[PDB]
């Protein structure tokens, strides 16, 4: 895994029509991985590769990376909120949150088999609750099921 | 003075669509994370985040399940993203050098 740098010229010709994104670090990133359950939730085999891959990727993209592993619903809520409230956000230009677990439409599972609603997660980082990120790009990546229906795929005509 | 909506300037990438399962290889990890890392590391230098998520969508659409003797054999998945972004989001990696 290697991240090709942007050229000075590409920066010069794109910065005026883009979010400001030049702080060092670019932002804080949070990688929250749930792999071991028990509370119908199978061990997330290979979940360890996802976590390591994202940690490396976000570091190479110039983020300061925070990691959390195997957390209950309530722990995720409290720690997401702690993260959102960190003082660094005022001096960074963006934020990244990646959530990797089992889930259902609109919510993800803690290792205790209880659910954290994604609406509540986004709310932690909104304009009213996270003023230090107002007008700054906030990226969320959610690796989790949104239902139990397998997509069998369809033939192409 | 200009005020803000309660929520804006977010982009959320989802591994799968509403009602459906996201797929994960027991050795190689999640299709969506694997694709995301390959595209971002290759294209963050010259492509904005929303456009990179479109490239991720292309990779996911093309993939199919390998899990012989089970309901996941040849299965499919589609990723998506939802955006309240108000500008291009370039990560400008390694700038300044």
């Amino acid at each position: 895994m290697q991240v090709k740098p942007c050229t000075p010229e590409f920066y010069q010709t794109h910065f005026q029509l883009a979010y400001r994104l030049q702080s060092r670090p670019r932002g804080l990133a949070l990688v929250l991985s749930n792999v071991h359950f028990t509370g119908e939730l199978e061990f997330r085999s290979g979940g360890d590769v996802d976590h390591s891959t994202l940690v490396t990727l976000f570091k190479l993209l110039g983020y300061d990376v925070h990691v959390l592993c195997d957390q209950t619903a309530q722990e995720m809520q409290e720690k997401l909120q702690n993260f959102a409230q960190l003082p660094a956000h005022r001096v960074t230009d963006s934020c990244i949150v990646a959530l990797l677990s089992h889930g259902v439409e609109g919510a993800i599972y803690g290792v205790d088999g209880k659910l954290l609603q994604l609406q509540e997660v986004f709310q932690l980082f909104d304009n009213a609750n996270c003023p230090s990120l107002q007008n700054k790009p906030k990226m969320f990546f959610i690796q989790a099921c949104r239902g139990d229906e397998t997509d069998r795929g369809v033939d192409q005509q | 003075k200009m005020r803000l909506p309660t929520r804006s300037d977010m982009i959320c990438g989802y591994a799968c669509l509403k009602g459906t399962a996201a797929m994960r290889n027991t050795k190689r990890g999640s299709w969506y994370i694997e694709a995301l890392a390959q595209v971002f590391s290759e294209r963050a230098c010259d492509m904005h985040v929303a456009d990179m998520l479109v490239k991720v969508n292309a990779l996911i659409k093309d993939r199919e399940g390998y899990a012989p003797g089970t309901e996941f054999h040849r299965c499919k998945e589609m990723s998506e993203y939802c955006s309240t972004l108000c500008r291009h989001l370039y990560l400008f990696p390694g700038h300044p050098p």
């Binding site: 889930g103 099921c145 139990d148 | 591994a15 399962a21 899990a67 089970t70 996941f72």
Partner: peptide, 5 residues
Amino acid sequence: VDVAD
């Protein structure tokens, strides 16, 4: 092998 999240 491929499995569901």
